[PDB]
């Protein structure tokens, strides 16, 4: 390539180095709270005193910051520099810095965290060396003056061209532009990596999770047209869904529920994939409002399933698991509620499973079919499995009363099925 | 039947016909050897020029190929030819009646394999010579140990050992004394492709079902199993820039890139070789460079690259999908009409029956 | 005599050593927020080294010139590890009520 371009690359490699006094004054005057002149004049020591006071306040709120007080905020942390050390110690510093940003992600509207992060900014040059974790751990706060300050400071990586246009102005970016950013693809991959590490360190918060799920749902909502784009988007979003369910909080699990339901209604998936997702939900379901959300999204999953084998039964282990996590009286009451999501496909599959697998709770089958109005082909399907259960099982007055209910409702259909097989 | 006015000059405009090609190393560059009909050709790897072509047509069509440094080893019907710069330097008359199927070249040895489970071992004469020339011995593969011979490799760091992969198991041979010294256990499928790793004692077997089986040999206990469904795996290769990338090429014409450290499907290429002409018969990563080269049976040799990533810190999790790069090839079905271009006789128009003109 | 703890502390401060901070960053964890076949001729064999560039790389001391098989192949293993690095997947992993990983498993299966 050309000489000018290669010198531009060497300049980018030497962004951080403070060669002459002009470059030092520039790099120093870049800072977070203070404006130009005052940021230029004040010294590391005064910065570090302010930082230490802020860190004592933060450890008073929560004790996880004794680590950074021990390591990144001491006397050698005054003395040291990035641009002197060997690359492996550099990688260890990047490890500790990313730990800091992850752990301070959940306090960003407080002057204490603001000041300690200004220490990291004005000594470890993080706003030039590793801007990625700064932007991504501070993304959801996208209407706040602290984010406006970081936009006026930072130098963007070539994944963020939208914010790269919005740098250095008076208006915060808009949700449309955020949705452009998340409509990009490699950025989606990078965000999955960050969220994976965040879960595996087990520190998320509600606004963080809410912003993530709203961005993902709008991304799929835009891409409702290009099916090939949805097909290349499936592994990304569903693997973030699987890790998010693997987390142990009600917050994580409910968020993953919303992502799954909007994806399932946006694109018709395969039945085995649907069953695997249900298997994860049931295998990690823990709390009460979690049970509520899980039942709703399971219902919507089987509802948006449409194809051959639409009304097939649950496989055995799945059916045992589902009943065990879902006692029958609870789902009865949920049916008795007023909100009443559409439920016919899933409920018919459930009762056909109870028929072929349980062989006892036909009375509960009777009451469920009492409470909900179903469809014609479903009625014939129920009738088929009940007919075969009659032809095998030793007879029962409960089976008598069930067929009595069907004679009271659609006896001609019953006789049609007997004309298919029987008397 | 001889001629008296004309004489055969060369057969123009071919690259491959589906016989698995080989990659050779000189100094710190590379080159590609392929075979067409009764001859073989040698191409450049940085600009894809035509560097060499054999100068004697063979009495049969060439079936097996491999390459050491300067010499290239070709194997037609019964003999084995040892070529240098396309000039025929040596014959190697085999003492059987069978047809020779696969080939390996390592150390003071050449290992040739026919169809009837017969492994011929040629020894180097004196280590100041460059190719083996003396007949040494003849191992056999009895049917009670394993079925038909599939391929022959040689792992890193095994003194006079040889790796035979058969239909049902793998064998570790000691060629010095001449004893089968290790056998593995029967595998339920038909093993079709083999490749050693850039790590120790690790071999890779590709079956007819979508199983990539990463196998140990110092222990003999298949480490990893990766599944591709609804295809028959046709070749493997490893990346060696320093990432954990594994490249699998099916017969249906796709290409799939996994990562081992993440168990992941990084990417997939769709229809780069036509299944109606034999499928992806040889796909190889060049050693330690972000360059992959594929060759089909549809008379085509392409090579793609991996782009360096767009993250700054994260990197190996956000890897660019491959892009397209150099390519040579010609007709698929035999041509139908030609004509010359001008009175310097330079360009040849030709339109073929797969609906294109070059 | 070795100096005690306060003398160590003052020494580190007044000389401005940063080895403590480096070992602290090193120990920094976001943790908390045989064989089965023998080769008799390989144990019997005696090979030379001094023939050319390759085994003269494999040499270890200046006096030795012929080395037998087990040390030889072990040296070759060391050399191969020098050239091709070892990745963590092959140093560690083996595949060995319903679980959690079923969704990711079916996702990695299907195309």
């Amino acid at each position: 390539s050309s000489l000018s371009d290669q010198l531009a690359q060497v300049a980018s490699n030497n962004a951080t180095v403070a060669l002459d006094r002009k470059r030092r004054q520039k790099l120093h005057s870049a800072s977070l709270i203070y404006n130009s002149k005052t940021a230029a004049t004040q010294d590391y020591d005064f910065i570090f005193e302010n930082a230490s006071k802020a860190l004592e306040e933060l450890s008073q709120i929560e004790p996880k910051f004794a680590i950074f007080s021990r390591t990144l905020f001491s006397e050698s942390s005054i003395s040291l520099d990035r641009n002197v050390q060997t690359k492996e110690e550099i990688k260890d510093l990047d490890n500790a810095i990313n730990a800091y940003l992850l752990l301070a992600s959940s306090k960003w509207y407080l002057a204490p965290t603001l000041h300690a992060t200004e220490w990291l900014v004005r000594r470890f040059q993080i706003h030039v060396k590793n801007t990625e974790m700064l932007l991504l751990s501070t993304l959801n706060y996208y209407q706040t003056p602290v984010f406006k300050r970081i936009l006026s400071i930072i130098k963007l990586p070539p994944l963020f061209n939208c914010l790269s246009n919005f740098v250095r102005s008076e208006k915060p970016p808009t949700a449309l532009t955020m949705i452009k950013l998340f409509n990009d693809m490699d950025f989606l991959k990078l965000y999955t990596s960050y969220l994976d590490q965040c879960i595996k360190h087990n520190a998320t918060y509600t606004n963080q999770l809410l912003f993530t799920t709203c961005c993902f749902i709008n991304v799929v909502a835009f891409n409702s047209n290009n099916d090939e784009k949805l097909n290349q988007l499936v592994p990304i979003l569903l693997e973030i869904s699987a890790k998010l369910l693997a987390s142990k909080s009600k917050d994580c699990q409910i968020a993953a529920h919303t992502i799954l339901v909007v994806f399932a209604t946006a694109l018709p998936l395969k039945k085995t994939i649907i069953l695997a997702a249900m298997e994860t939900i049931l295998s990690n379901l823990d709390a009460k409002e979690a049970k509520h959300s899980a039942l709703l999204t399971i219902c919507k999953l089987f509802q948006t399933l449409k194809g051959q084998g639409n009304v097939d039964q649950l496989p055995s282990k799945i059916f045992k698991l589902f009943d065990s996590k879902f006692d029958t009286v609870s789902i009865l009451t949920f049916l008795d509620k007023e909100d009443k999501p559409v439920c016919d496909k899933f409920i018919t599959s459930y009762t056909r499973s109870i028929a072929r697998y349980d062989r006892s709770k036909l009375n509960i089958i009777l009451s469920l079919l009492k409470k909900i109005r179903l469809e014609r082909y479903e009625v014939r399907l129920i009738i088929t499995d009940l007919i075969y259960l009659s032809e095998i099982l030793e007879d029962k007055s409960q089976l008598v009363e069930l067929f009595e209910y069907f004679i009271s409702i659609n006896e001609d259909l019953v006789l049609k099925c007997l004309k298919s097989l029987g008397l | 039947k001889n001629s008296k006015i004309f004489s055969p000059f060369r057969i123009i405009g071919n690259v491959s016909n589906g016989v698995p090609f080989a990659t050779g190393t000189l100094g710190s560059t590379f080159y590609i050897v392929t075979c067409v009909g009764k001859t073989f050709q040698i191409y450049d790897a940085n600009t894809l020029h035509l560097l060499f072509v054999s100068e004697k047509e063979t009495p049969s069509s060439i079936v097996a190929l491999s390459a050491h440094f300067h010499y290239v080893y070709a194997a037609y019907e019964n003999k084995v030819g040892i070529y240098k710069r396309g000039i025929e330097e040596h014959l190697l008359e085999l003492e059987t009646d069978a047809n020779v199927e696969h080939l390996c070249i390592f150390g003071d040895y050449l290992c040739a394999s026919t169809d009837d489970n017969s492994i011929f071992i040629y020894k180097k004469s004196d280590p100041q010579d460059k190719y083996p020339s003396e007949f040494y011995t003849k191992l056999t593969v009895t049917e009670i140990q394993g079925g038909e011979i599939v391929s022959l490799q040689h792992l890193a760091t095994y003194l006079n050992k040889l790796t035979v992969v058969t239909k049902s198991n793998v064998l570790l041979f000691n060629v010095r004394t001449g004893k089968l010294v290790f056998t593995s256990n029967e595998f339920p499928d038909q093993i079709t492709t083999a490749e050693p790793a850039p790590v120790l004692d690790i071999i890779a077997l590709g079956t007819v079902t979508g199983e990539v089986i990463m196998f140990n040999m110092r222990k003999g206990k298949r480490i990893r199993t990766i599944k591709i469904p609804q295809s028959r795996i046709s070749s493997l290769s490893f990346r060696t820039d320093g990432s954990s990338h594994l490249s699998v090429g099916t017969s249906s014409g796709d290409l799939i890139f996994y990562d081992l450290d993440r168990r992941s499907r990084i990417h997939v290429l769709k229809n780069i070789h036509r299944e109606s002409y034999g499928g992806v018969t040889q796909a190889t990563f060049l050693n330690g460079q972000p360059i992959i080269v594929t060759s089909g049976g549809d008379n085509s040799l392409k090579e793609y690259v991996f782009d360096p990533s767009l993250s700054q810190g994260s990197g190996d999790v956000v890897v660019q999908p491959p892009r397209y790069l150099r390519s040579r090839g010609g007709h698929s079905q035999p041509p139908s009409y030609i004509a010359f271009a001008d009175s310097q006789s330079h360009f040849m128009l030709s339109a073929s029956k797969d609906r294109s003109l070059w | 005599p070795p100096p005690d703890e306060e003398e160590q502390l003052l020494a580190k401060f007044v000389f401005g050593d940063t080895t403590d901070l480096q070992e602290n960053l090193a120990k920094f964890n976001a943790d908390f927020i045989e064989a089965a076949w023998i080769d008799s001729d390989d144990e019997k064999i005696k090979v030379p080294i001094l023939v050319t560039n390759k085994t003269k790389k494999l040499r270890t001391s200046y006096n030795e010139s012929k080395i037998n098989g087990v040390h030889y192949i072990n040296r070759l293993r060391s050399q191969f590890e020098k050239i091709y690095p070892r990745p963590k997947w092959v140093d560690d992993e083996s595949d060995s009520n319903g679980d959690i990983n079923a969704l990711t498993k079916i996702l990695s299966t299907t195309y």
Binding site: S1, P158, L159, N161, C162, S164, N165, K180, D184, D186, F187 | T25, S28, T29, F30, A45, N46, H68, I105, F106, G107, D108, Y109, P127, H154, A156, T157, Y158, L159, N160, R176, L286, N287, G288, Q289, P290, I291, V305, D307, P308, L310, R323, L325 | D41, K44, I45, K46, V47, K54, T55, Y72, L76, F80, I83, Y84
Partner: peptide, 28 residues
């Protein structure tokens, strides 16, 4: 403005390898 995708050039850099002709050896 979105992400720009300028696929930059490639250079076949140098490499290093292994050699079976020094894998093998001779009887005593």
């Amino acid at each position: 403005p979105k992400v720009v995708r300028e696929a930059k050039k490639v250079e076949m850099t140098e490499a290093r390898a292994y050699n079976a002709d020094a894998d093998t050896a001779k009887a005593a």
